[PDB]
Amino acid sequence: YRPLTLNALLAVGPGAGEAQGVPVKVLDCDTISQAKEKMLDQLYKGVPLTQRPDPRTLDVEWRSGVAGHLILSDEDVTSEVQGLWRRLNTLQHYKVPDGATVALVPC
Amino acid sequence: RCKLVLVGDVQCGKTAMLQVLAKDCYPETYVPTVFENYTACLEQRVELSLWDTSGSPYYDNVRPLCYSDSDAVLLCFDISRPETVALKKWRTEILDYCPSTRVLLIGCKTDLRTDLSTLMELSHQKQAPISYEQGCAIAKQLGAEIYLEGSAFTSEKSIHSIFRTASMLCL
Numbered sequence: 001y002r003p004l005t006l007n008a009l010l011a012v013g014p015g016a017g018e019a020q021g022v023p024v025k026v027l028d029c030d031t032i033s034q035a036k037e038k039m040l041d042q043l044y045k046g047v048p049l050t051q052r053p054d055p056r057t058l059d060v061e062w063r064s065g066v067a068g069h070l071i072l073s074d075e076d077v078t079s080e081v082q083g084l085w086r087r088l089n090t091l092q093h094y095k096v097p098d099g100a101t102v103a104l105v106p107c
Numbered sequence: 108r109c110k111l112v113l114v115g116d117v118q119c120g121k122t123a124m125l126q127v128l129a130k131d132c133y134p135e136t137y138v139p140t141v142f143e144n145y146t147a148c149l150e151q152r153v154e155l156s157l158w159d160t161s162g163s164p165y166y167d168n169v170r171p172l173c174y175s176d177s178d179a180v181l182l183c184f185d186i187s188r189p190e191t192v193a194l195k196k197w198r199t200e201i202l203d204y205c206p207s208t209r210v211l212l213i214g215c216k217t218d219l220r221t222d223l224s225t226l227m228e229l230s231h232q233k234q235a236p237i238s239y240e241q242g243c244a245i246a247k248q249l250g251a252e253i254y255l256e257g258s259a260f261t262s263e264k265s266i267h268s269i270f271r272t273a274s275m276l277c278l
């Protein structure tokens with residue numbers, strides 16, 4: 001594994017493009033949930049927990065290029081399977097690079 | 108409103124088409140894609156949402172996310188590379204992720220049929236560029252609706268033609 005810094009945004013909805021967010025240090029072996037949580041700890045630094053949003057109500061969107069945007073999730077049609085077991089998706093699974101914009105969008 | 112997804116081997120010509128189609132620009136230098144979205148308009152007026160993807164195994168885990176709610180997939184190949192005719196992997200990928208969606212077979216770099224250096228290199232491997240009728244046959248054998256082809260380098264008109272036919276098919 002390896003450390004990455006993402007440009008973390010709060011966004012009104014899923015969509016194209018990027019804007020100035022907050023640098024958030026994560027690991028590439030972090031699951032999409034763990035990275036969401038780390039992003040929210042930064043985007044809401046200093047804000048009491050009862051005033052933060054429930055992370056379960058937000059999706060993670062990788063914004064790449066000019067207008068590319070895809071929802072990442074711990075488990076989806078791309079997850080590895082072996083028998084009855086599935087591997088939770090990590091940033092490394094998707095190959096999210098260092099410096100990537102990732103938006104948190106209403107789920 | 109139509110959503111199209113382009114897939115096929117690396118360097119096969121997918122971004123070159125979209126850029127010519129949507130940006131009035133041919134990118135002669137290869138820059139590998141991860142994922143990108145172009146918006147084109149082809150005269151009913153049809154608004155196309157065009158999703159460009161990597162042809163690399165390296166991005167096998169993110170590219171399938173692009174298939175969701177698509178109207179058609181453009182399985183692309185390079186006519187100068189009868190090894191990009193991998194369309195085996197590609198068709199199985201489209202079927203595994205995207206079984207409701209129709210498939211168009213798109214041949215790229217048709218200008219290279221009369222490029223001497225391409226023809227000389229091919230002939231040293233006892234090969235020749237894929238022809239139009241070979242493209243029609245491959246389409247049938249991969250269970251694609253139609254075969255279409257053009258050259259992003261020498262005919263912008265052909266690229267517009269590909270997408271106007273793709274538009275008509277998704278509607």
Ligand SMILES: Nc1nc2c(ncn2[C@@H]2O[C@H](COP(=O)(O)OP(=O)(O)NP(=O)(O)O)[C@@H](O)[C@H]2O)c(=O)[nH]1
Nearest residue numbers: 117118119120121122123135136137140162259260
């Ligand atoms: N002769 C010729 N060359 C072309 C044509 N279209 C693209 N190319 C060449 O092939 C290169 C690679 O094409 P590109 O479209 O970038 O490849 P891609 O399929 O998008 N690859 P990737 O999946 O890796 O992002 C271009 O930079 C250009 O030099 C064409 O119509 N004719």
Ligand SMILES: [Ca+2]
Nearest residue numbers: 132133134135
């Ligand atoms: Ca150019």
Ligand SMILES: [Mg+2]
Nearest residue numbers: 121122139140
């Ligand atoms: Mg490309």
